[PDB]
């Protein structure tokens, strides 16, 4: 990414920063836990009992 | 009025729907349990779309 | 001449700090009277008269 640079020709290049992108530990933050907007539901066929 | 823990306004989600170009079917399973009583004057759909 | 009768959003009643009213699972949201529900914060219906 051009560590230094002057005007066309003489320049150094340092490598880019190590950036690891993966999922979280235990897949934290994929499933809406504790949100009033987005609440899951385990219920029977007595439908209303959530 | 009784004292045992039972609810007031039932929310039943449909068992299975048929989305078609011309119509949209919804089928519900209404459990009127033992020692319960429903007037269907209060029965209404709560439909929601764009 | 009341005019700020909106802006309430919620109402919770507890007897002796533990016993709820009406805690017999009477409401859809059973632990508090929910007055307003802002839409785009809403999934399972629970909105009247548009």
Written description of the protein model:
The structure is cut from a larger assembly and holds three copies of chain A (50 residues). With 50 residues, chain A is mostly beta strands. In chain A, 0% of the residues lie in helices and 12% in strands. Chain A is built from no helices and two strands. The first copy, chain A, has a two-stranded antiparallel ribbon. In chain A, a hairpin with a 3-residue loop joins strand 1 and strand 2. The radius of gyration of chain A is 25 Å and the shape is rod-shaped. Chain A starts with a strand and ends in a 38-residue tail after the last strand. Chains A and C meet through loops of A and loops of C.
Tell me the major beta sheet of chain A.
2 strands, antiparallel
Helix content of chain A: under 10%
Q: Helix tally of chain A?
A: 0
Order of SSEs of chain A, N→C? EE
| Quaternary structure state of the chains depicted | part of a larger assembly
Number of E-type strands of chain A:
2
Strand order of the biggest β-sheet of chain A = 1-2
Rg over C-alpha atoms of chain A, rounded to the nearest angstrom: 25 Å
Most extensive interface between two protein chains, with residue counts:
B-C, 10 and 7 residues
Alpha-carbon distance between the two ends of chain A: 55 Å
Shape of chain A: rod-shaped
Secondary-structure class of chain A: mainly beta
The share of residues in extended strands of chain A comes to 5-15%
Subunit structure (chain B): Homotrimer.
Protein name (chain B): Hexon protein
Subcellular location (chain B): Virion; Host nucleus
Family (chain B): Belongs to the adenoviridae hexon protein family.
């Amino acid at each position: 990414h051009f560590a230094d640079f002057v005007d066309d020709r003489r320049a150094t290049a340092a490598g880019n920063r190590p950036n690891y992108i993966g999922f979280r530990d235990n897949f934290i933050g994929m499933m809406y836990y504790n949100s009033g907007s987005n609440t899951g539901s385990f219920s029977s066929q007595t439908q209303q009992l959530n | 009025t009784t004292d045992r823990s039972q609810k007031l306004q039932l929310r039943v989600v449909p068992i299975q729907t048929e989305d078609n170009v011309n119509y949209y079917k919804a089928r519900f399973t209404l459990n009127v349990g033992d020692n319960r009583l429903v007037d269907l004057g209060s029965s209404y759909f709560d439909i929601k779309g764009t | 001449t009341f005019y700020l009768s909106h802006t309430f959003q919620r109402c919770s009643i507890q007897w002796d700090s533990s016993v709820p009213w009406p805690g017999n699972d009477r409401m859809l949201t059973p632990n508090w009277f929910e007055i307003k529900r802002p839409i785009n914060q809403d999934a399972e219906g629970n909105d009247t008269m548009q």
